C-alpha cells in the first residue's frame, strides 16, 4: 500500500535506465507498481520503456492506466499518442495529441507530435505552423527544430538558411556527445553540411534502436551454412524489400530476379508489404524462385526464423532507413552475409550489415571512412533501371516539322511507329552520323490534323487506321500503360506547347523533388540562365507550394517569371517521355537525381552534374561515366556553369552530345539489366568464396 517505498523504487529504476540496463529497470517499475498500484508516474515510465522494447501492445495499457489515475497528465497523453502512431492507428494518436493540447495549452511536445502527423500526410504548411508553435512554447527543442528544418527544406523556404544549417550541426554535435538519439533522421542527414563522421554516427544510433527491440526476444545466434551442399551447388540470395510493387525500387530492379542464373543461384524475395496488385508485384512473384510474403508474419522473430529455414546465404537489404523497413530482421543475423543494395543511398552504420554494394565512382577508396560496411564494387555503376523493358516505345522517335529541323518540339513514339510512317507519302529521314536516324514528317494536311488534336486538347485521332494519342491523356486511353505496368499500344504525340514551353528556346530541366535544391544550386542555375540569353528552366510542382517560394528567390537573383516554368507531376510513363522535350538536364548537386537520373538519360537528354562527397551526391556522375560522357561531369561550380552554357550557346556541340547520349543508352552497360545481373552474380560469389574460406567481411575491389 506504501507510496514512499514505491517512490524510491521508481528512482532506482530511473537509475538503471541511465546506465542503459533496461531489463532491470523493468523489474523495479513492476515492483513499484505492485507495492503501490495507483502510482501514475510509474505506469508512465514502465510504459515508455515497453514502447522502446517494441511491446506496444502492453505499453498502451499502462499509459491508459496513468491517465486514469492522474487525468491532468498531458505528458502521458502525448506519449500514448506516439504508441498509437507506431501501432498504425493514426486517428487514435491524433485524438491524444489534441486532447493533450486542450488540457495543457502550454505543453510543447504535443504540438510537435501533432505537426509530425501533418508531415506524414503531406500537409506541410500545417506542419510548419504547429512546429513553430512548439518552438515558441519551448525554444530549446531539438526534435521540433530539426523536423521544422526539414519541412522548410521540402518547400524551399530558405529564410536564414546559413544560420539554420550552423545550428543543425551544432545540435547534432551536442546530442552525439551528450549520448542521446539525434534529432536528424539518417535519410535526411545527406542534405545538411554535417561531417561524414556525424552522418555515420547518426546511422549507428538508429542501428542500435533495432538491437533493443530484439534483445527482448532472447534468441540464440543462428547456425549458418558453410557449404553449398544442401542448397545443391546453388547460392541462395534473399532480396528483402517493402517495395515489390508500384515503387521506384521495382522500376529499377524488377527484371533482376528473373535474370539470375538458375544453375548457380536460387532466388528468394521477401516482401515486407502487402500485394498492391500491380504488375510489378506480379512479375517478381512469377520470376523469383521463391516469393515469401513477410507482411503476414509481423513478429520479427518468426520472420527471421523463416529466412533461416529457407537457408539463405546472402541476404540483401533494399530498404535501409526508408518507410516499410524492418531492419530488426537483419539485426537477428539469419544469414552469414548481409549486404545493403540500391534502395537506401547511405551507410546503415550498423554492425549487422556486412557489405554495401556500390562502385568505384560513387564510393572511391579514400571516402571508405563514411561507411560502416565494407565496399563491394560493381564494375561500372551500382545503379540500374528497367527502362529498356518498361518503355521500349521510347527506343525510337520521330518529329514533325513546322518551320530549321529540331529533335524535340513535336515528338512521336510508339511500338508501331515505323509502320505508320510507311503509310505516309513524304517522309524525310535525317541521318544521325557516328544504322541510326530520326524520321521527319513534313507539314502536310496530316501533320496539321495532329497539331489540331494537340491544340484543341482532344484525346486521340485516327490516320490511315493508325491510332494516334495525345501525350497528356494516356491515363484515360489505358491506365496500365500510363503507370509503366504495360507498354502502350498506340502512337503518342508529345509537344512543348502541351507544357507551355517556348518553341524556340533552350530548355534546361530538373525533374526532382524540390527539396533537393538549395540556394547555391539555384544561384548556379540563375548564372547559367543569364549567360544563355534565350533559355528557360523547367521544374515540377513537387510539391506545388514550393513554386511561389522559388519564384521569389529567382526574382531576387534578377530573373523574370517567364524564365522558370513549372509543370505538374505526371504518371511515370508521361514523366519519362516528356524528358524528350528538354535540351539539357541540370542535376542538383546537393543530392543527385537517382531514378530521375535514369529517367532523363533514357529520354536521350544529356545531364550535367557536379559530384560532391556523399554517396547521394555522387550517383549521377557514376551513371554518366558508365554511359561514357565524362565531359558532362564538373569538378566545381564554375566548371558546371561553363558546360551548361556551352551546351546552350553552341548548337553544334549540343546536337553532338545529345546524339551521343541517344546512342550510348543502348550500347553502354547502363540500361543493360542482363549484364548487370551477371556482374552482381560474380560479385556475390566473391563474397561467398571469401566467407567460405573462413574469413570475416572485407573490401572487394576485384
Amino acid at each position: 500500500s506504501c507510496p514512499t517505498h514505491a517512490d524510491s523504487l521508481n528512482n532506482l529504476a530511473n537509475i538503471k535506465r541511465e546506465q542503459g540496463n533496461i531489463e532491470e529497470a523493468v523489474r523495479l517499475y513492476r515492483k513499484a507498481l505492485e507495492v503501490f498500484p495507483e502510482f501514475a508516474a510509474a505506469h508512465s515510465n514502465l510504459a515508455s520503456v515497453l514502447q522502446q522494447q517494441g511491446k506496444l501492445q502492453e505499453a498502451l495499457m499502462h499509459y491508459k492506466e496513468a491517465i486514469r489515475i492522474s487525468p491532468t497528465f498531458a505528458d502521458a497523453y502525448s506519449n500514448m499518442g506516439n504508441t498509437l502512431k507506431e501501432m498504425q492507428d493514426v486517428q487514435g494518436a491524433l485524438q491524444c495529441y489534441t486532447r493533450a493540447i486542450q488540457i495543457n495549452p502550454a505543453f510543447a511536445d504535443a504540438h510537435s507530435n501533432l505537426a509530425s502527423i501533418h508531415k506524414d500526410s503531406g500537409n506541410i504548411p500545417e506542419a510548419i505552423a504547429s512546429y513553430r508553435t512548439a518552438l515558441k512554447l519551448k525554444p530549446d527543442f531539438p526534435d521540433a527544430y530539426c523536423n521544422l528544418a526539414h519541412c522548410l527544406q521540402i518547400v524551399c523556404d530558405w529564410t536564414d538558411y546559413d544560420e539554420r544549417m550552423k545550428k543543425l550541426v551544432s545540435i547534432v554535435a551536442d546530442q552525439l556527445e551528450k549520448n542521446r538519439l539525434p534529432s536528424v533522421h539518417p535519410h535526411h542527414s545527406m542534405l545538411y553540411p554535417l561531417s561524414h563522421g556525424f552522418r555515420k554516427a547518426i546511422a549507428e544510433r538508429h542501428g542500435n534502436l533495432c538491437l533493443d527491440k530484439i534483445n527482448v526476444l532472447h534468441k540464440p545466434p543462428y547456425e549458418h551454412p558453410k557449404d553449398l551442399k544442401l542448397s545443391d551447388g546453388r547460392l541462395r540470395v534473399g532480396y528483402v524489400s517493402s517495395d515489390f510493387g508500384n515503387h521506384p525500387t521495382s522500376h529499377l530492379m524488377q527484371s533482376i530476379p528473373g535474370m539470375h542464373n538458375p544453375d548457380k543461384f536460387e532466388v528468394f524475395c521477401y516482401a515486407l508489404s502487402p500485394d498492391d496488385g500491380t504488375n510489378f508485384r506480379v512479375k517478381v512473384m512469377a520470376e523469383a524462385n521463391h516469393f515469401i510474403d513477410l507482411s503476414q508474419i509481423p513478429c520479427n522473430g518468426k520472420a527471421a526464423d523463416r529466412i533461416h529455414q529457407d537457408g539463405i546465404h546472402i541476404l540483401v537489404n533494399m530498404n535501409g532507413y526508408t518507410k516499410g523497413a524492418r531492419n530488426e530482421l537483419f539485426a537477428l543475423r539469419p544469414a552469414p552475409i548481409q549486404a545493403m543494395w540500391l534502395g537506401y543511398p547511405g551507410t546503415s552504420g550498423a554492425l549487422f550489415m556486412d557489405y554495401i554494394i556500390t562502385d568505384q565512382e560513387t564510393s572511391p577508396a579514400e571516402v571508405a571512412e563514411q561507411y560502416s560496411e565494407k565496399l563491394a564494387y560493381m564494375p561500372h555503376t551500382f545503379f540500374i533501371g528497367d527502362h529498356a523493358n518498361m518503355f521500349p516505345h521510347l527506343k525510337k522517335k520521330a518529329v514533325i516539322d513546322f518551320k530549321h529541323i529540331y529533335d524535340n518540339r513535336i515528338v512521336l513514339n510508339g511500338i508501331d511507329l515505323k509502320a505508320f510512317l510507311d503509310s505516309l507519302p513524304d517522309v524525310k529521314i535525317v541521318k544521325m552520323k557516328c544504322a541510326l536516324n530520326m524520321p521527319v514528317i513534313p507539314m502536310n494536311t496530316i501533320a496539321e490534323a495532329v497539331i489540331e488534336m494537340i491544340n484543341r486538347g482532344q484525346i486521340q485521332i485516327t490516320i490511315n487506321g493508325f491510332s494516334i494519342s495525345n501525350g497528356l491523356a494516356t491515363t484515360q486511353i489505358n491506365n496500365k500503360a500510363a503507370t509503366g505496368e504495360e507498354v502502350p499500344r498506340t502512337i503518342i504525340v508529345t509537344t512543348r506547347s502541351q507544357y507551355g514551353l517556348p518553341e524556340d528556346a533552350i530548355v534546361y530541366c530538373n525533374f526532382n523533388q524540390l527539396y533537393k535544391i538549395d540556394p547555391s544550386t539555384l544561384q548556379m542555375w540563375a548564372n547559367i540562365l543569364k549567360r544563355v540569353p534565350n533559355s528557360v528552366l523547367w521544374l515540377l510542382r513537387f510539391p506545388a507550394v514550393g513554386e511561389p517560394n522559388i519564384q521569389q528567390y529567382a526574382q531576387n537573383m534578377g530573373l523574370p517569371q517567364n524564365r522558370i516554368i513549372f509543370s505538374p507531376v505526371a504518371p511515370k510513363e508521361e514523366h519519362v517521355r516528356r524528358g524528350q522535350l528538354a535540351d539539357v538536364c541540370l542535376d542538383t548537386p546537393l543530392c543527385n537525381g537517382h531514378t530521375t537520373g535514369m529517367d532523363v538519360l533514357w529520354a536521350g537528354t544529356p545531364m550535367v552534374t557536379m559530384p560532391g562527397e556523399t554517396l547521394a551526391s555522387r550517383v549521377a556522375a557514376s551513371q554518366l561515366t558508365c554511359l561514357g560522357c565524362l565531359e558532362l561531369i564538373a569538378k566545381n561550380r564554375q566548371e558546371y556553369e561553363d558546360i551548361a552554357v556551352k551546351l546552350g550557346t553552341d548548337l553544334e556541340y549540343l546536337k553532338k552530345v545529345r546524339g551521343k547520349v541517344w546512342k550510348q543508352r543502348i550500347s553502354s552497360p547502363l540500361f543493360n539489366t542482363k549484364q548487370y545481373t551477371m556482374e552482381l552474380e560474380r560479385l556475390y560469389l566473391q563474397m561467398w568464396e571469401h566467407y567460405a574460406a573462413g574469413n570475416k567481411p572485407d573490401h572487394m575491389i576485384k
Binding site: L181, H187, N246, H247, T322, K323, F542
Partner: peptide, 11 residues
C-alpha cells in the same frame, strides 16, 4: 496522377 516517391522512416 499521384506519385510514388521514396519516403523516409519514422523517428
Amino acid at each position: 496522377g499521384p506519385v510514388f516517391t521514396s519516403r523516409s522512416a519514422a523517428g
